[PDB]
């Protein structure tokens, strides 16, 4: 019972107000040559959101390598918006560096399928990651109770400039999947003939016609991705709320 | 764009067929208690399809520790499920134990929006979390050139249960949220006699009256959710490509 | 190009939540005999809305004797509200006592006309005087630019429930009308016998048979309703900016 | 409900029959650089009403002063204004210098949402105050029994000038707000570059980022203002009634 | 164009207000075996209506003497109605004893369709003679620019009711017909043997079996609708212009 | 239940069968600059019926002298028509000299409104005055039961001429008016400045700024008006039955 | 309670994916001079539908030497399609060298009417014989439990092109007629003047003048199409399964 | 394109007209325990048509030894359809003994889909397969141009009679299939368990778990079924045209 856009769609023209001024998405990225997350959350002031917003804050330097950019929403206003920033800066010591949209008629999150049946007023934690052609490529719903995983918006995002550039498909669990490990998979034949051509090519590992791979992203590529999981996995050294 | 189920609400009752039999969901996982994850795959014999239910057979036992049942879904019919799961125990040497939904007219795919722009005829990577209630918790739109990865799907459900279980909401990368750590947040005051209450009291370690947490989540309950992440990140020991 | 509720109908039947909890209106108010004033500012830590909130608070006694409760309205959350309440307390030295709405969809924005061109997302300063049957006396639309006169609000009410107490129209600038000063007016005959038997009684005050008026108010009553105006009249010896 | 034109749009091109002729709005007061407050009441030879004009006609100069125009509105013919008028000369020895629209189809009244439930009839006290634009700049709704405070119509004029040449809002209460007195609002910022530019320019008294003014009005614009209001308050010298 | 009541319908069920008070329309004369006249008149203090409100003045003993009412519609208040009346008893000595129906909205006009081309927003002098079974037995419109000669209404009633108590059709120019005088007419056969039965019987003076008529109307029927006609046709001894 | 064209608008364009041709209404008339009274009766060799038509053609002369021409209609055929004028002639020595329409299929009817609930077959007595501009000036609705008074319909047309030639509108009752005899009446001021100026000039006899007269129809137009009224009210030198 | 393509219709354009590439139909056929029979089958690796598909295999070249194509069709995705091939090939010996439909949508099928009863998710066993000109000429629908005789569309195919290139239609059983043998059948006259021609020319073998025919197939026509019966009547001497 | 009933519906209820009375379809047979073969023929006195007809009346018996009855149909009246009864058996020597539908106005052909764009007026050559249930197990749409094999609807009812007792799918050319000759298909598992257990039971001989087949039809059912095929490829022994 509710709208969205969809993977491979362009991400839907709209003029949004935030914090840092007016922008048309996904224009004002296009134009830079940038993918974007666009992640919302139900409102400012409150405590899952402002761990995700520490969290995307600590990645940003990690996005902005991967020339991808941060986009927030939520339904409050912009004073809201600047007062929550201030109030992060001073009581966490962490400045967040990237805009949110203030969409207090709900407009942007009713086009983007943002409103579930948790909340009538508040947007639950979807994730919009789209490309530089302003294509969406991926959609994420978290609920209210549940913060991000967000070095997994990392992997995902880099997996698929990887893909995209390598010409491959990414496996489960990429760059440790359990059959091919780093490997990446070329995209199966359409026909009979193209099955026969790569069996009898043996371009590449197989399993069969329809499962080739190789290894050609580069050991920075890996390694990068594999730097996103193992912060996931560890224990951060020192708490933020030790000195706040 | 398309339309989807929405967070909050009950899964939609239907019939479907799978290769285990017919059954109603979400009636079949209610009656024993159980969460399901519902995942669907583009097409059988696909290569990054494959991956995936490698990934999830392999983490079968840690979605039963949790109560939590599997089923996929893609257009292909049973003959072709039964005909992809031998193939797979054959030439992977892994038995794919949970059951596929057989959605040749794309009737479940259209009722959960999973045809998006990327393919008129295929599922995306689609991920519904659902309760034992029946309640669709979260959910997950990965594309056709991306696998999932599994050990965030278990990190989910582990999170969510424990967020039911103790009436808590989850920090960003828990457990290893950068402010709390494995510390888990007390749903902030809805009133102002409430964030009066919250502030007097002194039970909670606390950065103002909407941010509060505890440490209530046993040892447990902690090593085991960062376990799943730890094997995300781990390299793995023995790639089953070279076995097969 | 925007509908209203109108004068003499009963205010729309609505669940409202507030930074004080959840009540209906108009019930929650007629089920206490109390008055409501509803009025509505565009948004959380706005300067023209903060004097307008610290006018209110100033005057709530005078509102409290009248029997009239206060209650407002904005598109902020009810977190943004409490925030902006504690704001107030701490800089300015002035508790905020009566509840604000939060209205983040504009649900409740969009049913009482609230939204103005001057902005599609933010209310303008609304006021409805809602009677204890719940019926819509009066409504006044300010803009963004101008804050409200409160004292004119207070006689509004007063003037209102001394005409439904004492049966009597209210005269032009009472109680300093030019003609009849804090006379009031006997609703005029609606007949040519009434007509003739109001002149021919010599019951009032008259300039013609439509236009009678006696002094039926009490001068506590006339006194109460001058102050609001000296009050509004006065420069205050005090600037609240001084020790904020 | 009914229908209505907001603050901010224009006000709705109309061709009027007035007892002064036929005029088109807001044309015949925008090609003069006059702004206009348009004014209803219910009813010709109605004892409030008539208060109300004699007040509008003593304060007649005071508009002229700012540039403003009034033309009132009734559902009656230009005969009975005509009439009417004579009789307020003749019985109360004030003229009204000022058009009175003759609406008898209510077709200006219901374009204007002057039709409330009190009366399907006769129009309520609605209020339009329309700048030399011709844009709705403030709508006020006064109910058949209470008469209108006109000094607050002249405060809501002048400030609303004052505001628009000093590139100012105003705060609650102007020219005696409790806070900055007679000073007046900078529009806040609405970026997190604007609100920072600000506060370290000092250029201003602030509270905080977003609550900036200064004391740009001349004595004389506050004095004036005062004056409306001293009036409102002051008893009058000479009741009208008695030389009657 | 426009649509109508008809001759022979019921008047319609109405609540109008006059100055006399609510009545229902035609019960408040049905109940009391009285025809009515109800006759439109554009506005209150104009000149034609003032004479035909004079002329229906001086018939009206004429008219309660037939069992017949009188009530005047404009679209103008009670109060100018009142004022209207008060005007024509000081300055032309006569006293309108009948009521004026208020109709501001039009609402009653355009029921009856009063509203002609000639003017957007007053009647035109409409007439209809209802009779004590509230059945419409005659329409007139008149137009703006010509006052209606009220000794026809006049011929109209009386004929109209010797028609209905004798049981006969009235020639025209009654009872002054150029054919057959103060004769009137039996209703012609309705079938051959009605016919033959007719001239056989040798009962009534003839021209033909379908125009057959006597003098069942009294000397006093006669000669009370000759006055009426004289009185049309004398210029009075005395103009009321003059006696002022 | 009936529709009907109103005074004001041009007669409605159609072309008419007639006993004497076939003609567009209302062309034939203006292209001679001749007015034409339109009027209908239920069905030939009717006795009212018959009576109309003799008055009517005894006052041909009369209407010929006003620039006049008359056109009958009834659902009757052109050959029941020329029969009953064949038969009129005959048996009551009378030629009626002016056209009937023939309206078998009540096309003509339904357009003029002339079915009313009397009869679902045959036309009331319906008058239609239209001027040398094709624009209907008044509209006379007789019922079955009731001639019509064909001297009032002269007097109307006479009334009408002359208030145009001369710009006047005619009182009650002229040139009989019980106020102002023969006096034609000015069109009332639309304006405070007309009203004053008109007052101050003396240019008229006055009894108010709206109620002006003068006397400037000639003698002849005035003797010849009250002539038509002097015949309705004689009764006649000889009845045409006698004869007959 | 469904919709077909008919007989002389052109088949319907539509692009659709094989597993030997995109076709566009009937174009792809029709631009190389071919005929195609598109038959549809329910699910890859069934047993009946295997059964077809090597009876199609083994008549391909009698198809081939018609200028026939064959085009299969199920919902099945084209990977199935050519694991179901390579499983045909290596387990009964039987290479499939015609494309496969794949139609997981049910798109084509649900344009050809292939979705009975029998199955709301797998298409019936249909058959749509396509002429050189794109024109369907049969169409079948054999059911899920009945293999089609493969042989009978063979029949079918040589008949309608031997009626094509000699202008006959095809007697019942033909080759082997009750009545005519391998006669074929002169289209009957469509007027008198060609029945009483043909009759009377004596030009060919009839039994009345709308039942005439001769024998112009070629010899190796004939038994062409009796090689097709003899084969679907005579037992295979060695089975496949007994090779498999 | 048309619209047709489906295998596995009802055939539709419908009261048809035929030569040898009315009957109710399908209940006319189901009531018997009688299957029945419904056909149709463009028009009655055409040389296909007949060839058919002869064709189904040679093959009678071998109809009423499986218990179906044969009904024709077209669009010819009951006249022309025993007028050309008559004619076959005078001319060819043989009777037919079934019934023909007439559908003169194409009611029965609209129903059943057997007007296709061939023609706008006659049938094609429809064949609905209908068992003893009402229920419609296969539908042929042959052309004009082209005479059915009635052997091969023999063989149809013959293997789906079979099919049903035995609860056995038939393979393609049966009794010949070149797999499994005359064996019969056991429905293929829809379960892996079901898969996993037939493959253990050791019960059928099998390909693979999804194709499993046994010979359970007697030899009287394999000879009687082949013995249909004999009779197709048979060149005829005595042409009936030779005696005719
Ligand atoms: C800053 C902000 O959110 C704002 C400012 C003016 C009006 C409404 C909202
Ligand atoms: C097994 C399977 O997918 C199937 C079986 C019979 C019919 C259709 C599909
Ligand atoms: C406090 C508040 O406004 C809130 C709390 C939880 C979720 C959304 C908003
Ligand atoms: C003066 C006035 O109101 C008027 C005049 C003529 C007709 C109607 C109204
Ligand atoms: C008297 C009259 O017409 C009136 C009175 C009150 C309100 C409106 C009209
Ligand atoms: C004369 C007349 O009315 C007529 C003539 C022919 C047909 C119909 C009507
Ligand atoms: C397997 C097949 O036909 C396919 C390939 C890629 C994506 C979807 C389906
Ligand atoms: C001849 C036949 O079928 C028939 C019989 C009577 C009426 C119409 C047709």
Request: net charge negative.
């Amino acid at each position: 019972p509710g709208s969205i856009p969809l993977i491979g769609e362009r991400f839907p023209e709209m003029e949004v107000t935030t914090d840092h001024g007016v922008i048309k998405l996904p224009d004002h990225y296009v134009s830079q040559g940038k993918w974007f997350v666009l992640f919302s959350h139900p409102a400012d002031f409150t405590p899952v959101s402002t761990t995700e917003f520490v969290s995307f804050a600590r990645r940003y330097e990690d996005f902005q390598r991967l020339g991808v950019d941060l986009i927030g929403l939520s339904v409050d206003s912009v004073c809201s918006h600047i007062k929550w920033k201030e109030w992060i800066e001073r009581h966490i010591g962490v400045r967040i560096p990237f805009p949110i949209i203030a969409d207090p008629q709900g407009t942007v999150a009713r086009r983007l399928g943002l409103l579930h049946a948790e909340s009538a007023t508040h947007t639950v934690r979807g994730v919009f990651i789209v490309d530089a052609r302003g294509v969406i490529r991926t959609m994420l719903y978290y609920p209210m109770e549940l913060g991000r995983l967000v070095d997994e918006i990392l992997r995902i995002v880099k997996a698929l400039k990887l893909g995209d550039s390598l010409k491959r498909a990414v496996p489960a669990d990429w760059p440790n999947n359990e059959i091919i490990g780093e490997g990446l998979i070329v995209p199966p034949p359409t026909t009979e003939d193209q099955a026969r051509a790569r069996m009898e090519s043996g371009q590449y590992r197989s399993l069969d016609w329809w499962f080739s791979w190789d290894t050609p992203a580069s050991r920075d590529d890996v390694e990068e991705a594999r730097r996103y999981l193992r912060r996931a996995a560890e224990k951060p050294a020192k708490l933020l709320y030790e000195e706040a």
